[PDB]
Amino acid sequence: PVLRSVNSREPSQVIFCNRSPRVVLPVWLNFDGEPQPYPTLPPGTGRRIHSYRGHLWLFRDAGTHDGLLVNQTELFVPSLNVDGQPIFANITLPVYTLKERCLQVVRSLVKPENYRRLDIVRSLYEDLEDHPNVQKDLERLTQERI
Amino acid sequence: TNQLQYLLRVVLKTLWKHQFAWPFQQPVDAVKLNLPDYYKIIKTPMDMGTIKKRLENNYYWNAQECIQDFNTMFTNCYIYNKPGDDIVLMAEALEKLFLQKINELPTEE
Amino acid sequence: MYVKLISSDGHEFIVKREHALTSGTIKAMLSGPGTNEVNFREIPSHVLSKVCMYFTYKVRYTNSSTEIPEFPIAPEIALELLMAANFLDC
Amino acid sequence: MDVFLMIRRHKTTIFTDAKESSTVFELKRIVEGILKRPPDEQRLYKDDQLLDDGKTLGECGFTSQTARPQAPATVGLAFRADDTFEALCIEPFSSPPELPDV
Numbered sequence: 001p002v003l004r005s006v007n008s009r010e011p012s013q014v015i016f017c018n019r020s021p022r023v024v025l026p027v028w029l030n031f032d033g034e035p036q037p038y039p040t041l042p043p044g045t046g047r048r049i050h051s052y053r054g055h056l057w058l059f060r061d062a063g064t065h066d067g068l069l070v071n072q073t074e075l076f077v078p079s080l081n082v083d084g085q086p087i088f089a090n091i092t093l094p095v096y097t098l099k100e101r102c103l104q105v106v107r108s109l110v111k112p113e114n115y116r117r118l119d120i121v122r123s124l125y126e127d128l129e130d131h132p133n134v135q136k137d138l139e140r141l142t143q144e145r146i
Numbered sequence: 147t148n149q150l151q152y153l154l155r156v157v158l159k160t161l162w163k164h165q166f167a168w169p170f171q172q173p174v175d176a177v178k179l180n181l182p183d184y185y186k187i188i189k190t191p192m193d194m195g196t197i198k199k200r201l202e203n204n205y206y207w208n209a210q211e212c213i214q215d216f217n218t219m220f221t222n223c224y225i226y227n228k229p230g231d232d233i234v235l236m237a238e239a240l241e242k243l244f245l246q247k248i249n250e251l252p253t254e255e
Numbered sequence: 256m257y258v259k260l261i262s263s264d265g266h267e268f269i270v271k272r273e274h275a276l277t278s279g280t281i282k283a284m285l286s287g288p289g290t291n292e293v294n295f296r297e298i299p300s301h302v303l304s305k306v307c308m309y310f311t312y313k314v315r316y317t318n319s320s321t322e323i324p325e326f327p328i329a330p331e332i333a334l335e336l337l338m339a340a341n342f343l344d345c
Numbered sequence: 346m347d348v349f350l351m352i353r354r355h356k357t358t359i360f361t362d363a364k365e366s367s368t369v370f371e372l373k374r375i376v377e378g379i380l381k382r383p384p385d386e387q388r389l390y391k392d393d394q395l396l397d398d399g400k401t402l403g404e405c406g407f408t409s410q411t412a413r414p415q416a417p418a419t420v421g422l423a424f425r426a427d428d429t430f431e432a433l434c435i436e437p438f439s440s441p442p443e444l445p446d447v
């Protein structure tokens with residue numbers, strides 16, 4: 001009940017872009033800080049959408065449940081539109097860490113039901129069986145208020 | 147009387163605790179909403195929280211007099227709001243969920 | 256200006272200091288107190304190559320306006336790169 | 346805009362960027378900042394292709410499509426040591442391939 005969208009009845013009309021080469025899952029955040037999945041955008045496709053000012057959005061990889069950057073940030077909130085009515089969010093691949101990128105790539109090229117038949121340290125098992133979950137990254141951003 | 151209780155404790159409650167359900171808890175304030183033509187088109191605004199207040203206070207006598215007050219709000223939203231208006235899409239979601247749980251409905255005492 | 260990286264098998268790598276420092280291990284080993292050359296006895300050169308490749312890409316594409324492309328990891332070397340990157344804290 | 350390449354001779358490699366407008370002659374002078382030997386004494390190849398000191402990095406291939414930061418292009422080097430020679434030095438490394446459970 002802290003990182004939520006305000007019950008706003010105002011127009012914004014945002015345009016998504018998916019400039020990332022992945023299948024983006026835009027997720028709208030409820031007025032109670034809950035993940036709401038919307039239609040997926042195939043790589044390199046952009047759709048003009050409407051929205052209300054004060055609603056909050058973050059993007060994900062629909063299949064590998066990775067995070068993405070909207071205008072170089074993890075979160076998106078609509079700006080002030082008048083005379084610039086189409087506020088525009090451009091989604092790109094985050095500058096991933098080499099560990100977590102390699103962590104992703106093994107998950108895609110191994111069946112997740114094994115993961116433990118690879119000769120790696122036990123600490124490195126719960127790194128790949130960690131899975132970039134949405135609300136997993138939410139708790140981090142709830143703290144990030146200062 | 148158990149049917150005016152399975153609606154109140156189970157059916158009402160799961161619908162009350164829904165994200166799109168917040169405006170459907172209080173009746174319209176046409177002056178602040180900037181539209182006085184609400185009462186002129188809608189003749190039975192007996193819903194939006196009024197459904198709850200009369201349900202605990204046993205004003206609905208049977209298992210169908212109360213359910214019909216539910217349909218009024220859903221249809222009411224359809225009547226005055228153009229099909230595909232965000233407020234309609236919210237009403238459609240509540241009605242969908244209402245039908246999902248009433249299909250295991252108990253016997254009326 | 257540049258710092259050399261040596262592999263277990265022997266291949267020498269000349270990258271810029273700032274590029275390598277992106278690794279948290281190279282950051283801590285290159286001295287809070289204090290000379291600029293390090294060798295890894297378990298990081299093979301074929302793996303170390305992708306390490307310096309990730310560096311050029313880690314530097315080139317951080318908070319930049321130009322569409323950030325995906326990173327190529329060959330599947331056979333993916334396991335070794337995980338352990339190396341795990342060790343390099345990057 | 347800019348090409349990203351990597352120059353090799355025996356177990357040694359250099360990771361650096363350069364502009365398409367520069368010629369191969371301009372690159373050799375930068376090499377002397379790392380390996381400290383005159384550009385006259387070194388000769389760059391493009392994997393069995395002699396490079397002339399007049400054609401730009403563009404004019405000899407090396408585009409932003411083939412030589413990227415994530416997958417740089419390989420370009421070679423040899424020395425003469427008093428007279429002239431010492432091609433070619435091709436010096437790879439091999440990786441364990443097995444996909445146990447992949």
Ligand SMILES: Cc1ncsc1-c1ccc(CNC(=O)[C@@H]2C[C@@H](O)CN2C(=O)[C@@H](NC(=O)CCC2CCN(c3nc(N(C)CCC(=O)NC4CC4)nc(N(C)Cc4c(C)nn(C)c4C)n3)CC2)C(C)(C)C)cc1
Nearest residue numbers: 009038039040047049050051052055169223226227232233
């Ligand atoms: C193609 C594609 N590819 C990739 S993705 C994608 C994509 C993206 C987006 C979309 C569609 N896009 C959305 O999904 C946007 C995005 C995000 O932004 C959320 N989203 C919404 O649309 C949301 N909608 C909203 O957030 C706003 C909805 C309001 C309007 C304002 N309102 C409201 N209106 C009214 N009327 C004026 C109607 C009168 C009436 O008959 N009423 C009968 C109920 C009694 N009356 C009241 N009441 C009750 C009074 C009141 C009281 C008590 N207080 N207040 C203040 C008032 C006024 N309330 C509350 C409801 C949801 C909830 C529908 C999801 C689709 C696809």
